[PDB]
Symmetry: D2
Subunit: 499 residues, 4 copies
């Protein structure tokens, strides 16, 4: 006997042992008589068009693939629920937080960032940790990472960042010169880069890492009063990492290590869970905060803004069909129920357009009609119609225009957005020079110990050594600007690696 | 008070007066607070991306259209049932014919041939009369026209034919020279052309014309014995046509005449119906038949092959949403339940491939998962997986490969095809000169009376006069080959039209 | 001899009389030996899969159609040039206006608004008059109508307006209750409806109507100084309209009248031209303007803001293939060269998003690589890569990320946008009650004469009589609000029509 | 200094040192003023829709991906030429062989079979070796593997085979039970499985393996005489393999080993080349051949059917843009110029449909218009029009129907297919028990030496040990049937691996 993942077909057969096998049909539901031999003229003659059994099967085989995600393509999924344990109704009126005890169905995707569909699980990379809450006020997608921060703080740099992380447009190879020419030209990366190359760069599967919303978000209570917040979901299973040595062995021994670990845990009843907390910053703490509180390269320090618990995320169910339920999952940061709103974070503002946009391409115009994407715990009603692959009565014969004197759906005034006042020139403000070093210095000196600093520098040098000298020089200077000993250690190791 | 079609919204409201109107949401199920005013900075300021309510609705609006059908684009739809009235089980074992009294849900689409989505209903053109039977053995699509015959007898001439009937590739205008250059170069068109320019070329709506499967099909009984057949469905409302003068007034007065007629009839309880008959030819009779029994430009004469009755088609339901239920309808002549099979008709052999092919483009790869297209009275199970817009459980965790020791679906040996023997060179055989005139001569002399022949020639001359003289000459010569008086009457009229 | 349009094929043959006809190939370039007969086993045998000549052609036929435009689907195209005739360089630094005499290639499309591909030309609807300028600074799309104004002033009402103008979602019929329910609920429509139902609602083809950008736009000169402007392009051929009576005859006699008129004109050297003028409003004048200067339902009166001439638009070339050059034409109001900017017009702010969005659906992700869409008078260079149907080098091996130390494309600082100051609450402002009546009153009383007022009301009553009584009442009231006699004349005529 | 692949961007900049960098534009050719900072109201304000620079770039980023290939997704490409060295015009009349010395440009793509886009190069799998010849008679696609044979001999088992080789539909994990259940239920796989688990299962890059067409094809000379043939292209660089130990190290050290090796070889002038040979079998030898000569699990032994040389394949140019030139490469076994025809091989018959079909889904309806797919050395002329993303003049105003009196393209009678006679029942013939063991016995005993047999069984057992015991037993039995000592060595090793 072997691990439960491998006994999948064995189990599927056992769970069916009582009934007869189904009649094998065409997609049109016509039974087939023989599907191992083609309709031909004579045993050694040519194939016939009449063989629509072959055509029907081949055409669908021919159309099996859809575009992979443009980032976060390698993915593992599971299902479960969110349960409220504490009362934060004074900050948010969202139905998902309505009383202690309330459960909401969730769906989760875990991913790496750079790799395509066939890439190894145990590599140095950030991890996507996206959570879809199926609430009565519609779906809530908290599309977060394994980090509170990101490498950049304006969405116009995003496609670039990603290009620089992926393959060279001519050679189709990972290119250290791209990676570090970008990172060194944009020192705002200093904070997230430092996180990346320390121990948590390679987590031991998905169950031993935290999730963050990373963005500042806005919560709105029943009175119309607003606060800003951060979401943190901390692992109940404890932070646990892989060493470079073990991560590399597994990269060839089990490219699908995280995917297997997740499935096996759930199947053996060992159900993983997280504790959701928030931090809260009032509008008048946001004016006097020393950095830009919407800067995605900055955290809110725990000393000044402590964690306030909200509840548990629990994963207790595996997908039944991986393609249907985890490859077709779409998360839109813009799916926000009343009580939860966007901050003016430049990066989050971008993600409000990007995701529904890419989903309309990757999946299709009507991708919200795909069961796992459906807001099945809410009644969708509006004046949208048609599109390719329309799957429900399309709304019926309801009046399709608004306003109307025929009692089609009505707007709900309580669901209006919080109103903020803004003033300034409409222009492109340069954010390149928001303090890129301070929080990093703290991280280096105060969070990391002696050994961890040493490994941090070894990890960095071990990858930066493959970039050209002029690029190394500039990266080193950026690291020096955080701490002279940071730069020095890295430079001592580069001197050796250069022969 | 007006016709029922005009009162559609009125009625929708009345049927609802007892409830409160639904909450208006985004596609993600989020309630909207205001949907008449955009989120802007100040009353005369610019739009924000934060307005996801605007984007969500606009992005769907933008994706509303799908490619119209490449032919038969203008269509009217309805739903009802087929009921068996007579016993033809000695010819076919198909479940849809199993006992007298058996009802099968049907869907029907009526169409013109050449015009695009906005064209007028009451024009000279053949009419499509596609019929989908939802049987327990899977769907059966009888994709027929208002005529027993077509213009050509090889599928390689079809794209041409259609091109010649549609718009000039440069000017985007209907082009008489294309129409008649083709027809004159291909006299096999003489039969259908004579049908088209008779009174029956403009039916008074969809309720007053016949349906034909036109092709020869094959029927297989329980013993494994086969005969060849034609399907005729005759209107129970009686043949009725529009005159040229009335058809033209309606063309601007009500471009949607046949659509409104069909809807109002069903809504006022006058449900239209057809009687399904067959003609049967034994394999032996096929060998001694004077023409090619699979030549789509030929009928089987009634004297030698009388109509045997089978059933009634009844339309008693209107569609609730026209896009969902009529624009997305897909018929495949290749959806044939055991007991019905194709003949070797060159034209039908082409249709076996073309329709599923075009559907994968027009609707999409999984178009069969769209409710109206679903074989919902059959259990679909096989080794096909994935594809864009996957809508069910994607057949779950079932083993996806065949054969397997894990009890996935099995082939059903009784559903094998009838075995026929063929012998000859694999080669492209010329069918341009199969008899092109005989059956037409009969039609001209023995089916039409004196007045009808006169109108036939007037309708032909009225359209042919716009073609160049060399094209007119050649067409007239083809008409002379049927009968000298046919030719000379047309020529006398062209002499006048040419001034 | 006939009109030039109908001699198209004749002329194509004459222009080729010297050369031999090309060898007919598969799409893959393989010469075909016979394309009139299918590869079968024996003359009355079944079709083989190894007929790849058949398949290759049918598969393309099957994929001929693409989605029609979601609005303005019925269209006519031509090509030509714009020529600067007057100096407005003090207002705009745009390369297209650089010197008197300067010519720029243009592409125009003319459309109706509501009809689908097959619909008649001579119907009451607004007309599209889209101009694409191929400038050295990239493409400039002036996507305009044959009216200075529009029915609504917020883009969130757009999809609804269009739904109401189109087909009932159940009956698939034009529905007067939808049309007038909307218009009567949204009186802002009063101005444009008044235009629509007067003589100019049916132009005598495309050569006898004006064009307008409708929107307020922003112009920016070499100094960085901005002004607001309107674009009017008046016909040099003179305004000319069809009467209801002749428009209806032509709707069946020649569904393609505007198409044919334009093609024949250009083919016979009678080249239509328009004169481009602007109106200019300074930023100061914009603060004191009595209405909202960016309200799409308002004009700037000629007394206070006279027309200032700029140049000529001339159409002197017909398309060669209609599909490639006129069905695939894409216009984006967002294509604006430096010198021309958007105003804060709520309506135009929406069009900035909508068009590129729909274009990616209707044609494809890389639609801008389609010859007629290409900015071929400029050099496209950036960090965009890949996508479906990539057609040039894909920009080679050039570094694909920005910034870089490898000399890929650089930003041009002089191309930066004009900076404006805005202040106010970020919220949804109600525009429902901006002055809906004043400019219409002026239209009714001061622009129209006696006869025209009469015809205006007859035209309104002829269509409004098909709506329910409660809808009539409410519409009439909106017209009374413009002028008591306006409401009255309409009501007297409805009184008659209601028997 | 490092390898040439790593210096790609370095070299790109050098090759450009003399010019100024290009102006950065929108896709519409509009220069951009700043592309690092988003348009916002105030430095800490929300993003605007007016930022069309952001949307234009993000929208394209969002549509970057297309469906990977359904099999052979991981790939490497190069370009060069084919040169004729010997005279085989007595067998084939194709222009590509027309005289000694004749050069034809080619495109090659090397690939693995099961892995997706991100999988490792140095793994046990067959290798695709597809060659596209750009002939005057249109494209010739020789779509071959690094082996003469395949695992199955009917096309209806293909989707299954592939499913069995890829991921479990629930766990998304590679599944040994699927792999060997299939292989053990279908012993026709014995031949190719033995090849695969032997030394040549993991080639040292693409330059050190052979290519085969595998299928029997047909050749036709000027006299209309025909013979059957096999294409073998043998590496000029010599067969060279990796050991299991090294292949596994490289799988994590350089997942893109083969890609890097090819690019580096070409860049340093060391240009790889292959020698094209055929085997020839007369129609009459085909009738007496001891096996089915069209059975894809069978080879033609060299003693009886020696290699005849034809020419050289040389790869001397790297792609400039990987996506444009290698990801969008499409090969159709159905692209065959006159002089080359298909045999009746059941498998090949299915490939005639599959490839164009999948290309229409993967790339698009008009994928043959993509530069690298174009038959750019032929003149494509026919009656095919339109489709999504139509890129040329769409063949202008040419008459679009056939036949015509207007001198559009004509069929070329010399390019008719060879005519063969076939006779038999049209039915599904069972090919499951054609000899499954004879040629495999020969391979085991006569081709492998003692050491190699040892490694073969070690390789087989190392993978087969993960499958269930009943599956093991069955596979071993299939191996015993080839030779008792084959099955018995594998069983001795499985006994140990099962503890
Ligand atoms: N305040 C925050 O939200 C976080 C801050 N940081 C870093 O700590 C600095 C000071 O934060 P402050 O709140 O004042 O200090 P604290 O000491 O209160 O917080 C330390 C935090 O760092 C996280 N952490 C520990 N090791 C690593 C690592 N190797 N990689 C990434 N994260 C790690 C811990 O997460 P855990 O709870 O799992 O132990 C803990 O939340 C910041 O400048 C920032 O660099 C990092 C994460 C969160």
């Amino acid at each position: 006997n072997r691990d439960p993942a491998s006994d999948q077909m064995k189990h599927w057969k056992e769970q069916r042992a009582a009934q007869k096998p189904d009649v094998l049909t065409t997609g049109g539901g016509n039974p087939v008589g023989d599907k191992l031999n083609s309709l031909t003229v004579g045993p050694r003659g040519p194939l016939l068009v009449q063989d629509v059994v072959f055509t029907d099967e081949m055409a669908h085989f021919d159309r099996e693939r859809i575009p992979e995600r443009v980032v976060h393509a390698k993915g593992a999924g599971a299902f479960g629920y969110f349960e409220v344990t504490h009362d934060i109704t004074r900050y948010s009126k969202a139905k998902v937080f309505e009383h202690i005890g309330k459960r909401t169905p969730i769906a989760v995707r875990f991913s790496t960032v750079a790799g395509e569909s066939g890439s190894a699980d145990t590599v140095r990379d950030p991890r996507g940790f996206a959570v879809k809450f199926y609430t009565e006020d519609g779906n809530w997608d908290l599309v977060g990472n394994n980090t509170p921060i990101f490498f950049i703080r304006d969405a116009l740099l995003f496609p670039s960042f990603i290009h620089s992380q992926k393959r060279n447009p001519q050679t189709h190879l990972k290119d250290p010169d791209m990676v570090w020419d970008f990172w060194s030209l944009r020192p705002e990366s200093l904070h997230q880069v430092s996180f990346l190359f320390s121990d948590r760069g390679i987590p031991d599967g998905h169950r031993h890492m935290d999730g963050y919303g990373s963005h500042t978000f806005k919560l709105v209570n029943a009175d119309g009063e607003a606060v800003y917040c951060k979401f943190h979901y901390k692992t109940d299973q404890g932070i646990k990492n892989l060493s470079v040595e073990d991560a590399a062995r597994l990269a060839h021994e089990d490219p699908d290590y995280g995917l297997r670990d997740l499935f096996n845990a759930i199947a053996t009843g060992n159900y993983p869970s997280w504790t959701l907390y928030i931090q809260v910053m009032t509008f008048s703490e946001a004016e006097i905060f020393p950095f830009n509180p919407f800067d995605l390269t900055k955290v809110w320090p725990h000393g000044d803004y402590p964690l306030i618990p909200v509840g548990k995320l629990v994963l207790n169910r595996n997908p039944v069909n991986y393609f249907a339920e985890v490859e077709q999952l779409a998360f839109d940061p813009s799916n926000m129920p009343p009580g939860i709103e966007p901050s003016p974070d430049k990066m989050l503002q971008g993600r409000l357009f990007a995701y529904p946009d890419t989903h309309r391409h990757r999946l299709g115009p009507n991708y919200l009609q795909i069961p796992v994407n459906c807001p099945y715990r809410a009644r969708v009603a509006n004046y949208q119609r048609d599109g390719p692959m329309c799957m429900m009565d399309n709304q019926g014969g309801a009046p399709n225009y608004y306003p109307n004197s025929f009692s089609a759906p009505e707007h709900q005034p309580s669901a209006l957005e919080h109103r903020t006042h803004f003033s300034g020139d409409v222009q492109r403000f340069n954010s390149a020079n928001d303090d890129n070093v301070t929080q990093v210095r703290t991280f280096y000196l105060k969070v990391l110990n002696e050994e961890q600093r040493k490994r941090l520098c070894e990890n960095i040098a071990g990858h930066l050594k493959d970039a050209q000298l002029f690029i190394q020089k500039k990266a080193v200077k950026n690291f020096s600007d955080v701490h002279p000993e940071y730069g020095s250690r890295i430079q001592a190791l580069l001197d050796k690696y250069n022969e």
